Amino acid sequence: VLKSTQTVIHKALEKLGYPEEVYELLKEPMRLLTVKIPVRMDDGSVKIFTGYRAHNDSVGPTKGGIRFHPNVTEKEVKALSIWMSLKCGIIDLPYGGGKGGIVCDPRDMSFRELERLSRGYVRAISQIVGPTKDVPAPDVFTNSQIMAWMMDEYSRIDEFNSPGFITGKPLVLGGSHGRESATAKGVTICIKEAAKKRGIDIKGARVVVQGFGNAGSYLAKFMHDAGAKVVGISDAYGGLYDPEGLDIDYLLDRRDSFGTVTKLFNDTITNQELLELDCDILVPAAIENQITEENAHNIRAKIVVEAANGPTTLEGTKILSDRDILLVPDVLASAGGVTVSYFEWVQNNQGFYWSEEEVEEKLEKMMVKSFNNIYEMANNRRIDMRLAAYMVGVRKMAEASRFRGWI
Amino acid sequence: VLKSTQTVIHKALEKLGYPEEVYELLKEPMRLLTVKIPVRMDDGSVKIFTGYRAHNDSVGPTKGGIRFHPNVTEKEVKALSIWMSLKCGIIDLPYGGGKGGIVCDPRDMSFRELERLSRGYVRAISQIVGPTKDVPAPDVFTNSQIMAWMMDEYSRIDEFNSPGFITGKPLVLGGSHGRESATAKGVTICIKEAAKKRGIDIKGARVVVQGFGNAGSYLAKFMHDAGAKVVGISDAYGGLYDPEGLDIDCDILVPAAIENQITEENAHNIRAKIVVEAANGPTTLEGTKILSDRDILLVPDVLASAGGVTVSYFEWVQNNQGFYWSEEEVEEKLEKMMVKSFNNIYEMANNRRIDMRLAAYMVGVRKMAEASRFRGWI
Amino acid sequence: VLKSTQTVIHKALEKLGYPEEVYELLKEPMRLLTVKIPVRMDDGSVKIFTGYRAHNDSVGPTKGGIRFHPNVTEKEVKALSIWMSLKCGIIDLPYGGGKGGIVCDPRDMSFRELERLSRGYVRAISQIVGPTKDVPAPDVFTNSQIMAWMMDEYSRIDEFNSPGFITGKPLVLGGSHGRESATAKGVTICIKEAAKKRGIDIKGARVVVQGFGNAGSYLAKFMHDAGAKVVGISDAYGGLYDPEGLDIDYLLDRTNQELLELDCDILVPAAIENQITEENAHNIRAKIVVEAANGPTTLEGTKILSDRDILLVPDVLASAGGVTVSYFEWVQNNQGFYWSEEEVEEKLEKMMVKSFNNIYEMANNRRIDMRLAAYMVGVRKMAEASRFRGWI
Amino acid sequence: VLKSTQTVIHKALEKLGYPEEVYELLKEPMRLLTVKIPVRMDDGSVKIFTGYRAHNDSVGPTKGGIRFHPNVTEKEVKALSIWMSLKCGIIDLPYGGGKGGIVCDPRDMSFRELERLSRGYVRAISQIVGPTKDVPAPDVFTNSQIMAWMMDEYSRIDEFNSPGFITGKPLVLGGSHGRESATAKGVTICIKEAAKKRGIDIKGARVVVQGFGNAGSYLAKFMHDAGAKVVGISDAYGGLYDPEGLDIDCDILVPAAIENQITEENAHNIRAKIVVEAANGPTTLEGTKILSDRDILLVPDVLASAGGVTVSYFEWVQNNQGFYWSEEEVEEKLEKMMVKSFNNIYEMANNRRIDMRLAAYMVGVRKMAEASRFRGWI
Amino acid sequence: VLKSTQTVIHKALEKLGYPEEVYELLKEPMRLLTVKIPVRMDDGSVKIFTGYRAHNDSVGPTKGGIRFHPNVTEKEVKALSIWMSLKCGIIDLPYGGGKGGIVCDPRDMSFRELERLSRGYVRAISQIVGPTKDVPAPDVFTNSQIMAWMMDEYSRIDEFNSPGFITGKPLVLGGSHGRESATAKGVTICIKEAAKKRGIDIKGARVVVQGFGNAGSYLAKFMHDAGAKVVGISDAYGGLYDPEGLDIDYLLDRTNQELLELDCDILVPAAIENQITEENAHNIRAKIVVEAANGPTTLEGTKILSDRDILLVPDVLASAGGVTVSYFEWVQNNQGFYWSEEEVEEKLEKMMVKSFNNIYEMANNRRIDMRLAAYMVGVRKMAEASRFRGWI
């Protein structure tokens, strides 16, 4: 995963004619903080939660969300941090890549516990974090409520309101319009572009979405409202299929806080079958490594847009290319989160807030602009979207690190 | 008195459906600093002035003016700080309410004495105020010069220019265009917007402005220039009426004078379709009800007058950017925010079958209630 | 020399009607830091460089560039810091004047030596500079790379990215679009705006650009593209004249007495000093003279042109394009949001227009030339601020 | 490996009667920072070095050295940070354990390269270290010069002299007298104090020092000067014995050499009444037991060698005062603390019927356990 | 002038065997801030005072006083800042040299005007000074009241009591006991310690104090109380001699050629410059000469005394008592704990003794006079520190 991100960054770097030294510098976050966080549990016990914060690169304050998952690991956190630098390079924000992770399961914890842990996180890392250093955001199993708690904790430490510290905030705390679903909106725009690029009509296109989380659900809905047929949908437990397009309104009706909805049905299919669902546009919005060497040949979509971090492997990606499938890379497709996060941060910087229309417009303009830069450079170079996107998303970081004398 | 403010806060929270605990939180400033400031007087003596700075609620940096007046009281600045939250909530500012006061009589103090006091005041409270913490402004007997001194003092303490510490500054110190007309203009925006709701074209609208003083006269020019038949004005010695329209060089009643003009005793008499308050408490509680029972749209002073606060906010934003807005740019943003504010309040009042006064109070109090809850304070 | 700057300051304050004490305040930088910077040289030796940083006046964060030159002097950086206030006042920036200088010869220093010096310079003055205090920029022999190093160093000291500490940065480090054309464009805006005042349509206006060098050539393309008959240009070996209008495009792609005495509407002296002198001032056929260089017209010439109805746009105002965009970069740094090339352009225009017009109108109301009125406007803001804040 | 340290921590907490949750808290550094440091190499290239800084526990500013070694590992610096807490608890320092490491080989790096790396290291971690936060020191291949560079760098970042950021500095930069002899002297104090407990006059005491290397030779001079019959010494090629006493110019055995000299295979053979470790793990676990079963007093290396840490602490104190101690003043304070420490540990071991090793561990771990509980962490 | 200080610095470094580059580093303050301070005068006017603050070298927080005098010059405060390093090196303080100066005449300024200036001075330089950066003190026409004002101002800027910013404070503001007698006592310690080196019992030692002014009279009481035969004193109108010993307590309650040529063990020139010259250096009967004033002995005289076995204790070492106690005040400020009069005394002694002995022993080992050796010891510490920190 990290190993893979590094091959493509290396290839990217080299393809641009960079000294090996630049790869060496970018291949891993320059600063990784891992922390132990004591948490008073409701049962009167005390549990030590392990946290991570990664700063890939500082040529710009680092930016990236914090996830709460049992399967989070230091390795994942580094790789996620590197993604983010690329996303910010790709969209062209004054950010470096960062990410956070706390080994825990919010499904097994209480509202109060999550707050204590949230506040515990900020207290462990406040020193290397803040409006001007490193701005976090939601990610897996975190929401605006967790951002609000953390923001509050940071503000009490700096002794004044520090909205810019962390993005994805509630509107009333200097949050931005459009952030809540920004990720999906970002994938949507990316789908529309890829569709228009392939001569595919969204009006009746069949779209399969793996994962029904915050990115997955809002996405499916945006595709539904775009008039698309969302035929395949899934959470961790399985998929739902309807060649005529699932009742999305209903599916996110039965949906719970954690994005599961599969259990309510008995006619469910497996997640690996879902990935082979006959369709135009496949949207991996779940866990990593879903398109490997052993199913890349079996996917029926001519367009695959990565809403999730690292959903397809190297060979998975090469194969997708060998057989003329259009793959919009994660470092592009999933970057609506940061982009709107970034707006939120500008608004925090200024103390003045944008309308939904202004966010929607700026968001669209930058993504479209980013898709085209990548799609075109992938053309001119006889290379895939991955390598192309990476080349776009590494440009600034490599140039800035050079200007500033690090390499 | 202070309880009057708390009654409003309670009523409003009540209607929103917030638990009693939220009221308990919001009923007093979460932070009050009262200070003693030694000032060297010109006569060689030394006088100790008592100052207060109140931060009602911190769901955003606090914001509010400082008055120099013999009769200012801790209880008063507390109360006023809360009202600032309301306004800030009403305009949807990224602020919380704050307020300052010094027990003194500027009218009996010299120029250099007032400066010493101003600097002393900042020296006393610097620890808890600033561009990111608490942004004062002018009030009763304070002005741009006082603001300047305070800004200079605060900047010395930070060791760098801190324009955004305090608003109402002179233009050269990072002040903002459009202060002079801020309040009046804010009223005009509420009047126009109220017109739209009642399907009343401004171009022929019969407008009545009580008080041809300072804000009144201004409002009259604004309607007459907007093509309204300003069919009536009044100062302190009666009024002028002319159905054809008075050449300032009914549909809308703008009470721009004193309190208790619209009472139970004459509320049923009001011919106007819209009443936009351009002054403090022109209409009693009954009158407000009566007008409500009748289909008369009553635009609350707390919303109508928020123009001043809004532009003070713009100054702070400009300070943050280090970039300063043209007179037109100030104007349009002032409009968008007033319109946005009028409409949120109008629509809540419409949906909830209550007057705009009460709905403004809810909107003024709701934001810091949501924020305080989000941040785990309640 | 430094007194020359002080004379201007005095004259301008004089006319505004400020008391002598205000001049006394503004005549010198309220703050001067001179430092000794040890640099490890490649030859193994150690050389101690002398650096200066001057803050003229603090009615806003100070702003101004740093030059690396063998001949830079404390007296010079002092003088220059004051000129920066003037410009800042002229453009109405929320700045005060500042200026830096290091006694060194970059031409004889290696890449890694220049970096060491740059970092040492920041290390030396970090205490009194920063995004909210004093914002340097490039000058004589300093560039975006030097700016980058300095920015990196300052950021290390704050322990966080501080783009707004120093302007003229590379784009990736939070620099701003529209630096390259800043000055030239600022001139063009003054030219157009001057046209409007004299009721001169640009679309047929006979334009004369002296110096077909770097800014001159640019100005020619701008008028020719704006539909002006660029009826004349000149480099160092004479000039071209053509009443019909010279196709500048034909020339990008490929006497001096006479060029200036050409029958034209707009004369843009974009060359050297003392072209417009008492000896030929009455000869100038142009209705408008917009300076695109330093001191092209002597003091007499300025008067003569004034006595005649010739509108003379002062270099100090015409060239403020560079400073203005450096300011935009700082603003963008404050926002953490970066402006499109077009957005930079329009703001550059609005400020130049606003500035031209304040200065033009003061000159008109007060029956004086634009030079003097610019000086008043350049000096008036910090005089008002300093008084408001109780310094005088 | 790291678990070895954790086993000790667990065992010690176990015996103190702390709940499992305390162990969970103390088993890992509450804070680990790992950094990548670009260094310009002399050959023109650029090498990225990996650095770590670990803060075990914050019940006081953390304290611990930095090693430059090809084989240093994150797991190692973590482990070592914990051992620093133990020592700090043992000496009763107002510290918590911290530790640094850079993966590099100083032996292959030039003078100017090592400086760049040192500055880069400080630049990388400056945010979480400092005189009040985390105080590094020299270790494996780091020295006073490296300390100096790091101190200079940190001072530049604070914009003022920060001697107390890092210890082991040269005297001119605020270093402390008595570093050279710190460890050795600490041993001598434990030896004398152990003597007192066993009613053994030093003046005639037969002393045996294994290893006549650097610390061994020193210890021999100290006993011989104290009037002990240093009846035996040894280097790597055997030993000297002389009942009359060897003129360095048994009662006490001071193993000052290598690990596993005192094993189950010979533990019953030891004639000495007191064994004071002046090196790392000279006695196996069994041997420690055997000596315990026999009435042989075994002074633990972790306590005996705490001289170095203690003087590094003195340097930090002097830095705080901005006042520097005479060589004698350092000596006496070093003694009082070692004596105080020896005695707390001896008495706990006596009261609780356990060896000094285990009791030292308890005392080393108990302080941060009490502090962490007092501060509501557990 | 400033070169005189630099000559000493060079000579001393020279002898230590430091390369020329070290001298280049130490020859000027690495940091000089000169400021313009607007003060509202009582007559309603506004006067702009010029102030300087110099940090010679940063191998420790800088330390040094501020003088208010019409004749203070940038060159002077620079020079003086360097001398402070020397003293600091001599006493082994964790300091570097610093110095302040304001061009003004306190004698013509009112009480409230002097306060405004003092606050303005702190306001001007606050960015680069403070308890951890640069610690001023009183000098020529400044006192504890001025110190108090400055301390109050600085504390306001930090928003907390910062006693350690500036020394020489009144006791209630965190000043230190033992200032009054600091210098005199430091001399006495050098005298006693010099005695020990020459095997001279104090109890019968014939002591001669030139100048029965303020420090002289004090020194006389100290020897007479220590059991020395103060066989001679002098003011400005000749001297008293009495082999049996003058009862200074009489004299205390209530010529110069001869007073100096008097048969004695210890000669303490506590008066003016150039008393010990080539013209009379061979005449001096004393075995030890301890300077209690500035430059009492010419360069030749210093040599002559050296050739003869006469021990000459340098003023720069003998007078370091004042600086030392100012340092104690700063330490106490750091601790927030204040020392008894006795505790100050003993620490003052230990440091003076330690200092005398390092300097004496270097002079003995290196076959040179104590003057030169003091200079080496005064300059050596910041040279070692600067090298350790990679500045040279």
The three state secondary structure string of C83-118 is HHHHHHHHHCCCCEEEEEEECCCHHHCCHHHHHHHH
B151·C390 Cβ contact <8 A: no
Joined together, the tokens standing for residue C10 give 């005095």
Q: Are E8 and E375 in contact (CB under 8 A)?
A: yes
Annotated binding residues of C: 63, 87, 183, 214, 326
d(CA E313, CA E306): 11
Mutate to test the interface with B, among C389, C391, C392 (most CBs of B within 10 A): C389
Q: A303, A310, A268, A262: which is closest to A287 by C-alpha?
A: A310
Assigned token pair, D60: 């006081």
List residues bridging with B123 in a β-sheet.
none
Binding residues of E: 63, 87, 183, 214, 326
Q: Which residues of D are catalytic?
A: 99
Start-to-end CA distance of chain B, whole Å, equals 26
CATH C-level class of E1-26+369-392: mainly alpha
- Distance (Å, whole) CA E323 – CA E93: 9
For chain C, how far is it from start to end, CA to CA, in angstroms? Answer: 26
| Residue A314, beta-bridge partner list | none
- Judging by beta carbons within 10 Å of its beta carbon (0-12, 13-18, 19+), is residue B230 exposed, middle or buried? buried
Burial of D285 (0-12, 13-18, 19+ CB in 10 A): exposed
Contact residues on chain D for A29, CB-CB shorter than 8 A: 36
Residue D30 touches partner A, C-beta closer than 8 Å: yes
In the CATH scheme, what is the code of domain C27-161? 3.40.50.10860
Q: Which of C379, C380, C361 shows the shortest CA–CA distance to C370?
A: C361
E66: exposed, middle or buried (Cβ count in 10 Å: 0-12, 13-18, 19+): buried
Residue in the block written with tokens 């969300």: A65
The two three-digit tokens of residue B154, written as one number: 């605060």
Q: Which residue has the tokens 């009359």?
A: D244
Q: Would you say A222 and A216 are in contact if contact means Cβ atoms under 8 Å apart?
A: no
List % helix, strand, coil for chain B (3-state, nearest 5). 50, 15, 35
Alpha carbon distance A137, A167 (integer Å): 5
CATH code for the domain defined by D1-26+355-378: 1.10.8.1210
Instruction: Measure the CA–CA gap between B310 and E146, rounded to whole angstroms.
Output: 46
Cβ contact, residue pair E94, D324, below 8 Å:
yes
Measured between alpha carbons, how far is D76 from D68 in angstroms, rounded to an integer? 12
Any D CB within 8 A of A172 CB? no
User: Taking Cα atoms as reference points, which of E86, E88, E93, E99 lies closest to residue E13?
Assistant: E86
CA–CA separation, A371 and A331 (whole Å): 11
Query: Which are the contacts of B45, defined by CB distance < 8 A and separation ≥ 6?
Result: none
Are A101 and A76 a contacting pair, CB within 8 Å? yes
Does B165 lie at the interface with A, CB-CB under 8 angstroms? no
Q: Is the dihedral of CA E145, E148, E149, E150 positive or negative?
A: positive
D33 touches chain A (CB under 8 A): yes
Coil, strand or helix at B341: helix
β-bridge pairing E229-234 and E239-241:
antiparallel
Question: Considering only CB atoms, which chain E residues are within 8 Å of B126?
Answer: 159
Helix axes E341-365, E74-91, angle to 10 degrees: 90
At residue B99, the 3 state secondary structure works out as strand
How far is the C-alpha of C295 from the C-alpha of C270, rounded, in Å? Answer: 10
For chain E, report the end-to-end CA distance as a whole number of angstroms: 26
Is C121 buried (19+), middle (13-18) or exposed (0-12) by CB count in 10 A?
Answer: buried
Q: What does DSSP say about strands B62-63 and B134-135: parallel, antiparallel, or unpaired?
A: parallel
Spatial CB neighbours of A266, under 8 Å, sequence gap ≥ 6:
none
Instruction: State the alpha helices, DSSP H only, in A248-355.
Output: 248-251, 271-274, 314-322, 330-333, 336-350
In angstroms, rounded to a whole number, what is the distance separating the alpha carbons of residues D311 and D330? 7
Q: How far is CA A361 from CA A217, A356, C48, in A?
A: 22, 8, 54
Is C61 within 8 Å of chain B by CB?
yes
Q: Which residues contact C198 (CB under 8 A, 6 or more apart)?
A: C265, C287, C288, C311
DSSP for A372-395, please give it.
HHHHHHHHHTT--HHHHHHHHHHH
B133 and A173 within 8 Å at the Cβ level: the answer is no
Task: Tell me the C-alpha distance between A174 and B58, whole Å.
Answer: 13
Of A148, A161, A349, the CB nearest to B61: A161
A50 is an annotated ligand-binding site residue:
no
Amino acid letter for position A17: G
Q: Which amino acid is at A384?
A: D
Q: How many Å apart are CA D359 and CA E29, to the nearest integer?
A: 56
Q: Do the bridges between strand A134-135 and strand A62-63 make them parallel or antiparallel, or are there none, so unpaired?
A: parallel
CA proximity to B134, closest of B144, B126, B124: B126
Beta bridge partners of C210: C234, C269
For this entry, resolution in Å reads 2.4
- The number of C-alpha atoms within 13 Å of C294 and in the hemisphere containing its C-beta is 1
User: Which CATH number is C181-319's, of 3.40.50.300, 3.40.50.720, 1.10.760.10, 3.90.1150.10?
Assistant: 3.40.50.720
Whether D129 and D164 have beta carbons less than 8 Å apart is answered as no
Locus of tokens 């200024």:
A350
- CATH topology of E1-26+369-392 equal to that of E181-319? no
Tell me, letter by letter, the H, E, C secondary structure of chain D.
CCHHHHHHHHHHHHHHCCCHHHHHHHCCCCEEEEEEEEEECCCCCEEEEEEEEEECCCCCCEECCEEECCCCCHHHHHHHHHHHHHHHHHHCCCCEEEEEEECCCHHHCCHHHHHHHHHHHHHHHHHHCECCCEECCECCCCCHHHHHHHHHHHHHHHCCCCHHHCCCCCHHHCCCCCCCCHHHHHHHHHHHHHHHHCCCCHHHCEEEEECCCCHHHHHHHHHHHCCCEEEEEECCCCEEECCCCCCCCCCEEEECCCCCCECCCCHHHCCCCEEECCCCCCECHHHHHHHHHCCCEEECHHHHCCHHHHHHHHHHHHHHHCCCCCHHHHHHHHHHHHHHHHHHHHHHHHHCCCCHHHHHHHHHHHHHHHHHHHCCCC
Phi, psi of B253 (to 5 degrees): -105, 120
Closest CA to D138 of D178, D169, D172, D181: D169
Indicate the length of chain B as a whole number: 378
CATH ID of A1-26+384-407, from 3.40.50.720, 3.20.20.30, 1.10.8.1210, 3.30.1300.30: 1.10.8.1210
- Number of residues in chain D: 378
Is D214 annotated as contributing to ligand binding?
Answer: yes
Rounded to whole angstroms, the Cα distance separating C92 from A205 reads: 56
For D161, the closest of E58, E334, E381 (CB atoms) is E58
CB contact under 8 A, B156 and E157: yes
Angle at the Cα of C278 from the Cα atoms of C276 and C280, rounded to 5 degrees: 60
Sole residue written with tokens 């002074």: D299
For residue C81, the surrounding DSSP H or E stretch is helix C74-91
The dihedral of CA E194, E196, E200, E203: what is its sign?
positive
**Residue B233 parent element (H or E):** strand B229-234
Radius of gyration in angstroms for the set of CA atoms belonging to chain B, rounded to a whole number: 21
Residue in chain B nearest C60 by alpha carbon: B161
Chain B positions touching C335 (Cβ under 8 A) are 321
Q: How many CB atoms lie within 10 A of CB E1?
A: 9
The technique by which this structure was obtained is X-ray
Q: How far is CA D172 from CA D119, D375, E350, in A?
A: 19, 38, 18
- List CB contacts (< 8 A) between C116 and chain E: none
Q: How far is C45 from chain B (nearest CA, A)?
A: 38
**CB-based contact, C133 to chain D, within 8 Å:** no
Whether C230 contacts C254, CB under 8 Å? no
Alpha carbons D101 and D209: distance in angstroms, whole number:
33
Catalytic residue among A78, A99, A192, A229: A99
Contacts of B157 in chain E (CB under 8 A): 156-157, 159
Q: What is the distance between the alpha carbons of residues C19 and E242, in angstroms, rounded to a whole number?
A: 69
Bridge partner list, E48: E38
- Residue B22 half-sphere exposure toward CB, CA atoms < 13 A: 24
Binding-site sequence positions of E for NAD(+): 183, 214
DSSP designation for B130: B
d(CA E320, CA B111): 49
Which residue in the set B172, B320, B324 is minimally distant from C59, CB to CB? B172
Token duo for residue E329 = 């005040």
Q: CA–CA separation, E139 vs E53, rounded Å?
A: 13
- Residues of B within 8 A of A163 (CB-CB) are 94
| Residue of A25, A41, A48, A74 for testing the chain D interface, max D β-carbons within 10 Å | A48
The CATH label, of 1.10.8.590, 3.10.20.30, 3.90.226.10, 3.40.50.720, for the domain at A181-334 is 3.40.50.720
* Pairing status of strand E96-102 against strand E311-313: unpaired
Say how far apart CA C177 and CA C344 lie, in whole Å: 7
Q: How far apart are CA B186 and CA B305, in angstroms?
A: 6
Q: How far is E213 from chain D (nearest CA, A)?
A: 34
D157 touches chain C (CB under 8 A): yes
Give chain C's length: 392
Longest dimension (CA), chain B: 66
- Is the minimum CB–CB distance between A111 and chain B shorter than 8 Å? no
* Cα of D297 vs its chain's centroid, Å: 21
Question: Chain C within 8 Å of A349 (Cβ-Cβ)?
Answer: yes
Query: Is B169 an annotated catalytic residue?
Result: no
Task: Give the orientation angle of helix C74-91 with respect to helix C3-16, to 10 degrees.
Answer: 30
Angle of CA points D295, D301, D306, to nearest 5° = 130
Residues of A in Cβ contact (< 8 Å) with C173: 59, 400, 403-404
Please answer whether residues B267 and B290 qualify as being in contact, where contact means their C-beta atoms are separated by less than 8 angstroms. Answer: yes
- Nearest CA to B326 out of A43, A190, C87, C357 is that of C357
Residue E44 burial class via C-beta count within 10 angstroms: exposed 0-12, middle 13-18, buried 19 and up: exposed
A227 touches chain D (CB under 8 A): no
Q: Compute φ and ψ for C290, nearest 5 degrees.
A: -110, 110
Domain assignments of chain A as residue spans, ordered by start: 1-26+384-407, 27-161, 181-334
- Which of C321, C326, C377 is CA-nearest to residue C350? C321
> Residue E392: CA atoms inside 13 Å, Cβ hemisphere, count?
23
Report phi then psi at C41, rounded to 5: -90, 160
DSSP code per residue over C121-162: HHHHHGGG-BTTTEE--B-TT--HHHHHHHHHHHHHHHTS--
Say which CATH superfamily domain D181-305 falls into.
Answer: NAD(P)-binding Rossmann-like Domain (3.40.50.720)
**Residue E257 is which amino acid?**
Q
List strands edge to edge, sheet with E206-210.
E239-241, E229-234, E206-210, E266-269, E288-290, E311-313
The phi and psi torsions of B174 (rounded to 5 degrees) equal 95, 25
| Spatial contact of E312 and E371, defined as CB atoms under 8 Å apart | yes
Q: Is the CB of residue B326 less than 8 Å away from at least one CB of chain C?
A: yes
Residues whose CB falls within 8 Å of the CB of residue C339, separated by 6 or more in sequence, listed in order: C176, C177, C328, C332, C347
SS (H, E, C) D25-69: HHCCCCEEEEEEEEEECCCCCEEEEEEEEEECCCCCCEECCEEEC
Q: b/e map of C274-303 (b: 16 or more CB within 10 Å)?
A: ebbeeeebeebebbbbbbbbeebbbeebbb
Q: What is the DSSP string of C185-233?
A: HHHHHHHHHHHHHTT--GGG-EEEEE--SSHHHHHHHHHHHTT-EEEEE
Catalytic residue positions of E, numbered: 99
Is the distance from CB of D321 to CB of E334 less than 8 angstroms? Answer: yes
Element housing E331 (H / E): helix E321-335
